[PDB]
Structure formats: C-alpha cells, structure tokens
Amino acid sequence: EYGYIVTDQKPLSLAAGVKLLEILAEHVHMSSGSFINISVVGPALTFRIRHNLSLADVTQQAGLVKSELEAQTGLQILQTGVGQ
Amino acid sequence: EYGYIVTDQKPLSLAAGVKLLEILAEHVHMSSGSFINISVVGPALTFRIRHNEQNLSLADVTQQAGLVKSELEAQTGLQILQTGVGQ
Ligand SMILES: [Ca+2]
User: Region (Sufficient for dimerization of proICA512) spans which residues (chain A)?
Assistant: First the structure.
C-alpha cells in the first residue's frame, strides 16, 4: 500500500511534492524523513511511511489541512487516498 | 468533495458499483441508501454520504473500503486499486 496526493500540476515537481510532505509531517508531529519511498509521477505524489501513524491517518490529516497545504505550496489538491 | 473507489474494471458498471457500496454499508453498519450522489466514471465509483445516525465521514468510509478490499474483491470479482477523497 502507498499514500498519494493528486495535484493540478502538469507535472508535479519533486521539490513541491517534498514541500507537501514537510508541511504534512509538521501537522502530524512526525519527522518528514519518516515519509519514505517518495515519487512524483505526472500530477501525483506517492509515498509510504516509516516505522514511527498509518497511511490512513496521514491521508485523513492531508484532507484536514488541505487549505493550508494549497496555500503554502501554490497548488491545488484534487485527490488524496491510498493505493495498492 | 466526493469519496471514491477505483477498480480494475473499465467501464465500471453502475450495478457493480452499488454492489461495492452494499458490502461496504453492511461492514460499517450504515444503510446503503446513505451513499448519495453516486456516479461511475471510467473504472471509478464516486459518492457522497448523507446525514446518518452513525455520524460517519468520507475519509471514514473510504478508509474502511480499503480495509475490506479483499472482501469487496472476493464478493464482486473486482480488484480495488485506490480509495480516497477528491474535490
Ligand atoms: Ca482547492
């Protein structure tokens, strides 16, 4: 399983994807280095989480703070979820 | 915003989509009629959730759909590839 965030960026930069994860990490009180196996592919950011909070927790939290994520990164978040 | 379930069936049938919802509803102890504004688009099912006695959320029901993906797959033959919330 992996977490993902689909943005409006065509394509999403690696720098902006990591910025999303830094902000997300802060909101869940985890080190951003606990986001592992990160990739950007087209508009999407994908990631897993290291031993430390679950993917469910973090994608739920990404919804909770979506406004803040969008304002700080200058992009729009179109989907957040879990894949496998 | 909408909840969604992405399958490996393109086009996904409406009837199969709502069978997914019936299994999910049984698992979360909600009436399936509390899934509203339903559509199928490509391989995906999209929906919202009505006021319900259980006070359940989108992340809540889409999290659950991911947990019971083996059961959704066993019962319907679909493969569940993604679950999430969209805008
Ligand atoms: Ca937005």
Answer: 1-84
